[PDB]
Amino acid sequence: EQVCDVFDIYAICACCKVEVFNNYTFRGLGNKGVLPWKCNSLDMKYFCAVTTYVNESKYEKLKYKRCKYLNKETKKLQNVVVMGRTSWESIPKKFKPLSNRINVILSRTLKKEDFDEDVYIINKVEDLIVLLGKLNYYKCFIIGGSVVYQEFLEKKLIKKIYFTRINSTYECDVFFPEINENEYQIISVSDVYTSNNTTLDFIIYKKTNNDDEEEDDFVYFNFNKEKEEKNKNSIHPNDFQIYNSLKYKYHPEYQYLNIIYDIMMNGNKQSDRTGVGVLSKFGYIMKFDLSQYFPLLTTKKLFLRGIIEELLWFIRGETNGNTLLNKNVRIWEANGTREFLDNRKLFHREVNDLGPIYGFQWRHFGAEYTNMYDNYENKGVDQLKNIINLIKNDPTSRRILLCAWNVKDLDQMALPPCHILCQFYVFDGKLSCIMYQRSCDLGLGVPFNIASYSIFTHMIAQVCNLQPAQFIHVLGNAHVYNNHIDSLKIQLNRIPYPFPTLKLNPDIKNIEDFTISDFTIQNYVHHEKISMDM
Amino acid sequence: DIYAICACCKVVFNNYTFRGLGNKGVLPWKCNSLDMKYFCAVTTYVNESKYEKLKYKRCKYLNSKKLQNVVVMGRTSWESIPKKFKPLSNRINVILSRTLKKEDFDEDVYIINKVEDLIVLLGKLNYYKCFIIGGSVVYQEFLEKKLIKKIYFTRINSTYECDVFFPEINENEYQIISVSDVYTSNNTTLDFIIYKKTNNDDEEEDDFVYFNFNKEKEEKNKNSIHPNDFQIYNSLKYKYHPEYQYLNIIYDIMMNGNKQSDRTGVGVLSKFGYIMKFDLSQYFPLLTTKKLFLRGIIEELLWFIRGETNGNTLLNKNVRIWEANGTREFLDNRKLFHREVNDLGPIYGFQWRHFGAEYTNMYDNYENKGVDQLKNIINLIKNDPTSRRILLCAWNVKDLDQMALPPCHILCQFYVFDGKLSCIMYQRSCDLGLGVPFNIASYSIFTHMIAQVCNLQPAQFIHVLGNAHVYNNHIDSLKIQLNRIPYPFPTLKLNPDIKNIEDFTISDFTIQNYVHHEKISMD
Ligand SMILES: NC(=O)C1=CN([C@@H]2O[C@H](COP(=O)(O)OP(=O)(O)OC[C@H]3O[C@@H](n4cnc5c(N)ncnc54)[C@H](OP(=O)(O)O)[C@@H]3O)[C@@H](O)[C@H]2O)C=CC1
Ligand SMILES: NC(=O)C1=CN([C@@H]2O[C@H](COP(=O)(O)OP(=O)(O)OC[C@H]3O[C@@H](n4cnc5c(N)ncnc54)[C@H](OP(=O)(O)O)[C@@H]3O)[C@@H](O)[C@H]2O)C=CC1
Ligand SMILES: CSc1ccccc1N1CCNCC1
């Protein structure tokens, strides 16, 4: 029975990045006696919530345990907070003492007499442990600063860390102690939020190894499922240790990563026209909150330049592969070759002429396609203009779809579009986008697709004078390639970082007027590159 | 800790419609492999590391370690069991009796003089919980003697011959608090419901609260609905019946939906992006919480497949789904001043068989003009099962303005695996109160139809909702529906002989064992 479990001693801190990314990139605590960031409202509200939360039921078990360990026998309940003097003098004087909590301050230079407020002054750690045997309290929170943090981990007196990752860089002179992957391991990671123009999430470290007759009902109703051998696929335990060890997976990136797992664990084995080899499943939905982040996957490096050039290329209505290839974007290069077009029976189509695909269908749906050099001036339906006009003027229309699946033109296309349709939704001056994907490459393709349509929602929202809200991705045929597996296993065992943010040059007001430099990914912190294949 | 278990089949409907227990000293149905397995696992399970708390309960009322449960039946129900089955493998069997004695039977097995004298053995024996498989009279005797504190009821959704029945459970005295998944075994639908006696690292649970620190609802009703009215809904512990996919999206939109006023000014709660998945190999998902009729939507489905846009064809069969959209007035408001009345334009039927053709009028022969997409998806299912290009798309962008209205149902996508066919239908605009029930049936049928002509087995129908709305003046009606407890789902029997998608006729479609609550007027 170590002292932290009996007396429930925890740390809560908030760290920013300081002027190969790792989890000791988040480590900036304070600058010139204050926070590097000035105020974070959500970091504050989380801190208030965690440190002021008690549950009176549980107390009697704790009051017991505490009497057990400490060889003893059988106001409204509060938690303890414990801070350094510097940290205490850093607090606004109307906010001190921290309300509805037991304030404990570590100081040598200052005795009790030096303090007006209702606080407990102590001059060493051993004394805190004394006071926690003398007091009625729920949980003890160590709230810093740097010296108090370092000391308490030093003595292995902390049982969990409540770690806020403020996903921006600021000037810092005090740092959080480095954490050993050995001694402490992340068991939980939260949703990403935006506050005060930065993203943040909340992760929990744990100290490492080194009315109750209706429980059963669940077992009954689960009598007809699988075995461990009708859990379909062999793909083992150990190979997702860090994934399965996680308790709460509330980061949105686990939306994508859980589907990987479901396909891997529960996928159907198929071999396409190719003779390749996949695990596939049918019909999922991912919702991302664009108002709170830009969901660029963090469990591997992603380059956004090419997929942005491609979006602008569509918006122009271009079907000309050369255009991309001059800008050094090879997305559509293998779909533009003599061989590929010849195997598509497109014998009369020019090299890199991809035909009536996204560009055309968005600007000119149902015009007879000629070649990539034709301007289709006022021919067919300008869907893109149409949807921008319906968002402006009829935001409660249920007919705001942009659709790339023109049945008439499929055989004329290099490939039929994987991204069938975008439908739009407007509420309270905010814009959401459903995108339906017929076929989905989970290992290589979906990461870019999420980003792509996520940027497109921002673009539309901007020129329609609305705020971006939810991007909703609907997967039809959801497959993992068999050779993608080894690399996807590596990725599932990586804990996401807080998402980056996307900034669009605000001056752009028409959908046609966006250039590569109008886009900026701020604060993309990410695990290292993975070659999906081998 | 005394609960009964049973299976009951059929003999307008309420819950009690399920009562048939026995025919001529045996079961009305022959034998159900999954009902026996459930029945088995319910009485094969004892909570390992719990119940020392009932060495401090039963012994503080009445002043080995293999640890099975009791399994209390009667002579009539002891004689009913086959020889090889008895005694009930790995269970403490009792028999309530008069005529029997312990000098025709063993000491491992037991009997009791009467039900009062059961507590003689109960206050003498060692187990966890008392399971009563009983019978017509061994059940009735534990309802009138209010002994039973829960039932583990199988509902067999078939009608047999019966001499014995179950005692009608008392509308107040007991109430269902859990409904299972619906399944198929021995060519019947069945589900599993639990009835209750009315009272009339523990670390990482605060971690939950801390993560739940930024959720809006401070008791302030996010929407104006009074959940105090879904008491039966909110009471339900496990809501595993698939009809709860529908009902749970009704709940969500009511409680968290955005208040919007349409053109008319009608008023709706709306959300964006849902999925419902129905397992058509275990049931036909025809909502049970309100009477649904299907002759109309099946005839609408045949019409589409024929390539018709002639409204009159449907109206002459008293299918009026497309009536209001055919009027001089509706077509004029669509700016369709040159469209004949009940000429609905290049809608579903025209797009399914002639996508890209130039629509003339509803009477023109379009034979061999435009893309025959229906034909093409059936060919793709057949010649390219593993293709990811198997779509049937009714949203032709060049043709929208020519249509009486654009298709509410955008596209069907088809997946084939291990001789089984699953279908996604993405719906752009979803009236949850009225239209979506029909949408779920209409497209579930379509899957069965496509599956049979392709020599495949229906697997999943998957319903994707875009703009998902409840009309404000449906709210009272849906609140009623949310407190009704789904029945077991019916089945769909397609005439096995029909092998062209185009050869189906209304008579080739029978819904079977369709049990449902009274009809509701959404208003
Ligand atoms: N981002 C965050 O979550 C947090 C940030 N902060 C920031 O961190 C900085 C303050 O932390 P840092 O400068 O280390 O200062 P600390 O808050 O850790 O204060 C250290 C001082 O407290 C006293 N102290 C510490 N340990 C003991 C001990 N064992 N016995 C007796 N006294 C002890 C001493 O005071 P004395 O000199 O009187 O002996 C010591 O000099 C500020 O910039 C503040 O804004 C603070 C908390 C949280
Ligand atoms: N659906 C299900 O889960 C199950 C259904 N069944 C079926 O249903 C029927 C089984 O039950 P049902 O036929 O009533 O038979 P029961 O199970 O009700 O058997 C009751 C027997 O116990 C004795 N008894 C009855 N009342 C008393 C009393 N008040 N005091 C003392 N002894 C009493 C009598 O035996 P005596 O006087 O002769 O000693 C009587 O024959 C069969 O058709 C069987 O196949 C069987 C099991 C499960
Ligand atoms: C604990 S010092 C403090 C004093 C006054 C307000 C907030 C803090 N916090 C908690 C949020 N994270 C930064 C430190």
JSON list of C-alpha atoms in Angstrom, two decimals, chain A residues 394 396-398, chain B residues 260-268 270 429 467 469 471:
[
{"chain": "A", "resi": 394, "resn": "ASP", "atom": "CA", "xyz": [-32.42, 28.86, -49.04]},
{"chain": "A", "resi": 396, "resn": "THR", "atom": "CA", "xyz": [-33.17, 25.14, -45.00]},
{"chain": "A", "resi": 397, "resn": "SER", "atom": "CA", "xyz": [-33.25, 23.43, -48.48]},
{"chain": "A", "resi": 398, "resn": "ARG", "atom": "CA", "xyz": [-32.74, 19.64, -48.22]},
{"chain": "B", "resi": 260, "resn": "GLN", "atom": "CA", "xyz": [-36.05, 25.20, -37.96]},
{"chain": "B", "resi": 261, "resn": "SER", "atom": "CA", "xyz": [-39.03, 26.78, -39.86]},
{"chain": "B", "resi": 262, "resn": "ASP", "atom": "CA", "xyz": [-39.40, 25.55, -43.53]},
{"chain": "B", "resi": 263, "resn": "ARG", "atom": "CA", "xyz": [-40.97, 27.48, -46.48]},
{"chain": "B", "resi": 264, "resn": "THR", "atom": "CA", "xyz": [-44.58, 26.71, -45.19]},
{"chain": "B", "resi": 265, "resn": "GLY", "atom": "CA", "xyz": [-43.56, 27.69, -41.60]},
{"chain": "B", "resi": 266, "resn": "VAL", "atom": "CA", "xyz": [-44.45, 24.13, -40.40]},
{"chain": "B", "resi": 267, "resn": "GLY", "atom": "CA", "xyz": [-41.64, 23.76, -37.81]},
{"chain": "B", "resi": 268, "resn": "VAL", "atom": "CA", "xyz": [-39.31, 20.72, -37.40]},
{"chain": "B", "resi": 270, "resn": "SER", "atom": "CA", "xyz": [-33.61, 18.44, -37.37]},
{"chain": "B", "resi": 429, "resn": "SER", "atom": "CA", "xyz": [-34.37, 14.29, -46.53]},
{"chain": "B", "resi": 467, "resn": "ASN", "atom": "CA", "xyz": [-31.32, 15.96, -43.12]},
{"chain": "B", "resi": 469, "resn": "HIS", "atom": "CA", "xyz": [-36.42, 15.68, -39.14]},
{"chain": "B", "resi": 471, "resn": "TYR", "atom": "CA", "xyz": [-42.32, 17.59, -37.79]}
]
